[PDB]
A = this chain, B = another copy of it.
């Protein structure tokens, strides 16, 4: 009648991963701002907020099922980036990690015959397809136009209102 402990903890850990993603994109916004990419910064701050809502959805599934979500220690998301391109390469990699972890969670759910949690997960499976499309689109814009300061100026302006 209740979630297995395995499933509870994997859901908890994914909630933390969503929280880390939020703090990551927030931290990356600082780099952007520091390096004068205000458009890239605004996009990343809005995307950080979005990741909180992914975190909250997991938190809510956990409480709705009679469990206690646990926010664990959070590693500093601080990193050096050599370019805006390398920053957004890292974003895409991170989103690929999140997709992997959701697929693992879905695999655990099916293997455990946890149909409620499999069903809950579908939101994330779908979301992660949209996330990879979004961030791959940014890398693609940069690989096309990003090799000059003018190109970066334009893409940075695009990012300032992207996905709004």
Binding site for B on A (CB under 8 A): 1, 19, 23, 26-27, 29-31, 33-34, 36, 38, 41, 45, 49, 52, 56, 59, 62-78, 96, 99-100, 102-103, 106-107, 110, 113, 115-116, 118-122, 125-126, 128-129, 132-133, 136-137, 140-141, 143-156
Q: What is the count of identical protomers in the complex?
A: 7
* CB–CB A113/B120 < 8 A: no
* CB–CB B34/A63 < 8 A: yes
* CB–CB B100/A116 < 8 A: no
**Would you call the interface of chain A mostly helix, strand, loop, or mixed?**
helix
Closest chain-B Cβ to A40's Cβ sits at a distance in Å of 12
> A125 CA to B114 CA in the complex, in Å?
10
Closest chain-B Cβ to A41's Cβ sits at a distance in Å of 7
> A96 CA to B151 CA in the complex, in Å?
30
* CB–CB A75/B73 < 8 A: yes
7 A-B pairs besides A1-B96, A73-B73, A73-B76 with CB distance below 8 A are A34-B63, A49-B52, A103-B113, A107-B113, A110-B110, A141-B153, A150-B150
